Amino acid sequence: SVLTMFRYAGWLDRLYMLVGTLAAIIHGVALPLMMLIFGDMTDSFASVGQVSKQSTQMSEADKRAMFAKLEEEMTTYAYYYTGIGAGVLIVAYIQVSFWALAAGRQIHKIRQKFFHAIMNQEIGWFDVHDVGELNTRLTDDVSKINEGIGDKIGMFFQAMATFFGGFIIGFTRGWKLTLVILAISPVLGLSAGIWAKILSSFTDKELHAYAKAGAVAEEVLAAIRTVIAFGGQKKELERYNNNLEEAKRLGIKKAITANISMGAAFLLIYASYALAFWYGTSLVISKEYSIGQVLTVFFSVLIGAFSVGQASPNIEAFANARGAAYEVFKIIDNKPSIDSFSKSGHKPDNIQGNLEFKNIHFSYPSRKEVQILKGLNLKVKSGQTVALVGNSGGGKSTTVQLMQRLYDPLDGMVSIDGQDIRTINVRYLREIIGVVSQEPVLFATTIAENIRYGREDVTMDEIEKAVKEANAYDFIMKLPHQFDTLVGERGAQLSGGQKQRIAIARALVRNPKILLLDEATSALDTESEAVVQAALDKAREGRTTIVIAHRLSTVRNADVIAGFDGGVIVEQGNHDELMREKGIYFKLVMTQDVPPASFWRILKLNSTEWPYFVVGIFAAIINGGLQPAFSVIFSKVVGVFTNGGPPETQRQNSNLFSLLFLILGIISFITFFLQGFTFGKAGEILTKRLRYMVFKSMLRQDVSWFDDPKNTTGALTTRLANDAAQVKGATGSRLAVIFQNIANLGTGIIISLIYGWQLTLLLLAIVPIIAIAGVVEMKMLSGQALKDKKELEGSGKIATEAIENFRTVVSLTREQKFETMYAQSLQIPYRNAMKKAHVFGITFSFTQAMMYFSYAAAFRFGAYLVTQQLMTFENVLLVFSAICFGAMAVGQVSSFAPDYAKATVSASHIIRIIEKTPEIDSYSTQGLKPNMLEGNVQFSGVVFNYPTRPSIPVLQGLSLEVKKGQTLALVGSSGGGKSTVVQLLERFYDPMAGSVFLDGKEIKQLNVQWLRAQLGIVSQEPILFDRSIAENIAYGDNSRVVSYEEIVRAAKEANIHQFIDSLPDKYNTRVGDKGTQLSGGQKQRIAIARALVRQPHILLLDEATSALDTESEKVVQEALDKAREGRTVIVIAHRLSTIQNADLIVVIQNGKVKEHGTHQQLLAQKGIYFSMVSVQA
């Protein structure tokens, strides 16, 4: 799969690439042609003149005239060099700008198509794969592609042109010697190819490891409340660290192989030098060639050899890009069997729903050996209501998922109006179906936008009508900003009942002819449930509905009732018929200033491996100084080779130069490898340390930090990955080349000051000018860098919001809306990339142009000095070479400066997140750890305000008391603050008024880890992790290796053990992301077991039996009653029996305690609890 990286290159894109390639060819061949112009004559020296006093030459007047002639020749050469500099100015800008624009367009289209491909997959594909990596891909791999299809290919083609044009000039002049060097060239090609293949494979593995780490981080951050409650920060940090170690090892291998490749290239270049000199000597004694011929060949070929040796980093970048582009285009090329974006299907104009399920056999793709439905049969007529009843894991949610065709059945047929649903358009099929899931999931936006996700072209009046139909109007009206209130991830900033009612309204605005309600009133209370049922009954004739529920009134009111038993339906009829059939339904009803200093600050964290720094520095000075030193050595060797005054063997003896060239090649190989490897290893270790430290700091943060809309899970993951990537991009094998260039400039200055003088004053003139160019570029790029970061975060958020909630997006047919949102988010980075392309291309063109222009100015000034006889003609060439190398060094440093600007802000953000301290420090060892606690919980006038909505009073100073062995039942309406009490007792937030005492001690004076370890909580929405069942249960009691036997007994205590035993792989069965690959009852029971394995002193239950059977509820209640005394228990529920069985009951009216006492005490008085118990009875 090669050249797939350019799959999305259009006509304009290909034109940009072609013109950039042509400009690269011209720019590359400019140099060998310029040296051949010097080779137009034999000696490259217009006249020996005074330097040769071989003949008497006693002319004091004619020497002045021939000096004037030399000045004229130098002036003509300077004019030619100025023209070549202008041409270079044009061509370098053209090539870099065109290639960078091409890369930007391809990256934009690749991101768009990758997101489209991700949104185009099936539910089963999302179940099989760890989709948590995908976002990291969108952030990381595409970027690795961007630095491999940009300016790097332009530079590679330029150096290829230099090399091959020099070789063509060689075939023109000295074909035999040129063929001898082109015989060595294949070794360079083979080495480059092999090392590029190895580097691409290593990059693929490293990016896989980074994607694994990103998936781990995304899962941990999405469930940060569970991690904080159970104190799992260390374990998640270790899980991140394992993938960090793998990525670090792969990066070290990548650096090793890249530096081997570069050093081998340089060694081969020097070996080509040595062999060319040998063969030229051999031919120049045999009289086959003249001295001018072999010098011409040398000057034509060897500089291009150096050019390819310098080019090899672009090959490294292209190999990294190819390694990155593997999984992206593997996912892009995947074709789902159920295509939601296909336009080929039937679209019936009139559909009176006739849901038929004919001998349906189904098994989930992730767990395919287990059978769920075995010949399911159902016939639902138009406008009727069917109530699906059974036990947990029976397959009711499976039937709901099959109705909307999230999966296809292996056997059987699902049809509507006698038409099989596989022949109907998938988008049209899911558009006529409105579904409310077992535990709904919203999106991190306003309430109005969440409602509009059901149907986009919806007016505000009918939104209001649907919200009234869902009994949600009152609390939205009480909310400031109305329906523009922002809700957290998955509706985390709304209560369970409010979130469920918002989901109901979202389903209702769809105006569905097929309604699916999978426990739509699980989190509702009596009044809201009653009014919602009345509202649904008002408009029940128009549509056909399927309902799964726990309350008996809604099951009785259904037109027909179906009962699940072992994958089939065993009872199907009216309520009276099933009542008189004494079946399963019978026993169910019976049972009742962005500082620049930040760079150095981050590099100070890299001080542990300082020997790598010093070794790399030494090697960088060695090679950077060797380059101008080799410029002098080559000139001296050429001069000695020309002066063959002793005739032949003296010159065979000059083979010592091939020795010296081989020695220099060995030294260059060793030093280049050593410098690159040391810097790359230190930088990769720094990258690991930054990832680890930033993730640890993120885990240290408070719940309010994650409640901030800007600290979204996708935003957090994108921030982490991108900040680390930028700092790595400025701290890899690149700082080495800045040190090498500094050494190059220093050595050039030294050699120009030794051999000559008054010409280095020109070098001190060029160093400012070129630098100032990069300077402004740097500033400008920094001016946009921050913006880009922000935009990327936003884009990342959208992508994660689409991936973490993919089932909801598929059910809502909102994939196109999220694609449009992703494109709108990516809009700003696109224009930023185009502008940066233009600016950096201008910078490169300016650097090369001033290189050439200052070289011409050096010609002019040196000619003036020679005419004045202030400084000899022989040494001007070495000073000119030093000027050229210094200009190249400064230009390369200025080219680096953009990356320094881009990573300065990332380093600042990294330092900011590291040094941030939360208000409630979960990592602090300071605090009070009582030796033994009695478990007495007391809220004393606690007033709490949520930081995201600070004005709204949630708790207005309610008093609460519960003792050891007591059970406290918190009752109230939705939004009253029952879960707020649980979240406050976990020290998620600190109340501003009032205080919570645990055995008389304020919870702010205790160690937060110790306090959290004393409490076991079951949340309103249980959340598991994408790992094994046993690992999920053992996650309850961290800081201790939980044994298998106690996991088994905790599962037994939660009535989930039998289901685990029935599963293949038993307790090693992997659960999906957030528990999505489990039944709601099974997931809730596993959460209960996770809480119970702790054996906590303070048990907190928040609707812990929201989705359980009568059998499961009875078993769990008996298990809790076994251990009532000896632990304090607080329970939030709307079931009458659970509340009336508790020791004490507290009623919370809009945040205040209103009634407190036993069940009989509250029943005897005529209050709201009496009203509830009377309504239920």
Ligand SMILES: CCCCCCCCCCC(CCCCCCCCCC)(CO[C@H]1O[C@@H](CO)[C@H](O[C@@H]2O[C@@H](CO)[C@H](O)[C@@H](O)[C@@H]2O)[C@@H](O)[C@@H]1O)CO[C@H]1O[C@@H](CO)[C@H](O[C@@H]2O[C@@H](CO)[C@H](O)[C@@H](O)[C@@H]2O)[C@@H](O)[C@H]1O
């Ligand atoms: C180290 C720092 C150096 C300085 C840093 C920044 C330098 C920015 C210069 C880069 C530069 C010229 C590059 C030529 C260089 C020559 C060789 C270089 C030799 C180097 C020694 C990009 O080139 C522009 O040229 C345009 C045509 O000339 C092209 O327009 C496209 O062509 C087709 C494409 O598909 C299509 O038809 C179509 O898409 C376009 O028509 C584009 O190619 C591009 O926009 C100009 O950039 C900037 O120029 C200024 C004009 O003042 C513009 O200001 C704005 O213009 C209004 C627009 O709305 C605004 O309203 C106004 O608010 C503001 O005034 C900017 O917009 C921007 O363009």
Ligand SMILES: CC(C)CCC[C@@H](C)[C@H]1CC[C@H]2[C@@H]3CC=C4C[C@@H](OC(=O)CCC(=O)O)CC[C@]4(C)[C@H]3CC[C@]12C
């Ligand atoms: C070694 C490194 C540093 C440089 C490698 C050179 C590439 C940048 C050049 C070589 C050949 C060029 C390609 C020649 C032909 C094509 C196929 C063309 O797409 C197709 O026709 C493929 C089928 C499809 O449309 O899906 C897109 C441009 C592309 C990849 C060109 C893009 C630029 C390529 C890959």
Ligand SMILES: CC(C)CCC[C@@H](C)[C@H]1CC[C@H]2[C@@H]3CC=C4C[C@@H](OC(=O)CCC(=O)O)CC[C@]4(C)[C@H]3CC[C@]12C
């Ligand atoms: C010394 C002069 C002659 C220049 C040296 C480079 C060239 C000889 C060119 C011609 C063929 C080119 C190669 C042709 C194809 C590839 C594979 C391409 O993809 C891979 O890295 C393969 C990875 C994999 O298959 O897993 C990357 C660029 C590379 C090595 C090219 C690198 C540059 C090469 C060696």
Ligand SMILES: CC(C)CCC[C@@H](C)[C@H]1CC[C@H]2[C@@H]3CC=C4C[C@@H](OC(=O)CCC(=O)O)CC[C@]4(C)[C@H]3CC[C@]12C
């Ligand atoms: C005129 C001069 C420059 C010599 C002309 C020949 C070279 C340009 C050719 C001859 C043999 C070629 C090599 C033959 C085979 C390979 C292995 C190849 O490896 C892969 O990409 C393998 C990928 C896979 O197997 O999946 C990379 C290019 C390379 C080094 C080639 C690079 C270009 C070479 C040196």
Ligand SMILES: *SC[C@@H]1NC(=O)c2csc(n2)[C@H](C)NC(=O)c2csc(n2)[C@H](C)NC(=O)c2csc1n2
């Ligand atoms: S300065 C960058 C580039 N030159 C080299 O890479 C290089 C390696 S070795 C070498 N030059 C020897 C010392 N060159 C000569 O002896 C020589 C004779 S004539 C000449 N160089 C002309 C003046 N050089 C250039 O035009 C030139 C531009 S860039 C460049 N060399």
Ligand SMILES: Nc1ncnc2c1ncn2[C@@H]1O[C@H](COP(=O)(O)OP(=O)(O)OP(=O)(O)O)[C@@H](O)[C@H]1O
């Ligand atoms: N995405 C999935 N991948 C694999 N197995 C799954 C998936 N979803 C559910 N299961 C399993 O398939 C079986 C059927 O569960 P299902 O969700 O259909 O039950 P249910 O009737 O909706 O139950 P509940 O009353 O608890 O909501 C269970 O064993 C469950 O763990």
Ligand SMILES: Nc1ncnc2c1ncn2[C@@H]1O[C@H](COP(=O)(O)OP(=O)(O)OP(=O)(O)O)[C@@H](O)[C@H]1O
């Ligand atoms: N993270 C949050 N940020 C802001 N407001 C919140 C947050 N969580 C809950 N709220 C709001 O606080 C109020 C009560 O929330 P809470 O979850 O404590 O209620 P509850 O009594 O447990 O409700 P329910 O019975 O519906 O689960 C509601 O107005 C709710 O929208």
Ligand SMILES: [Mg+2]
């Ligand atoms: Mg279910």
Ligand SMILES: [Mg+2]
């Ligand atoms: Mg709640």
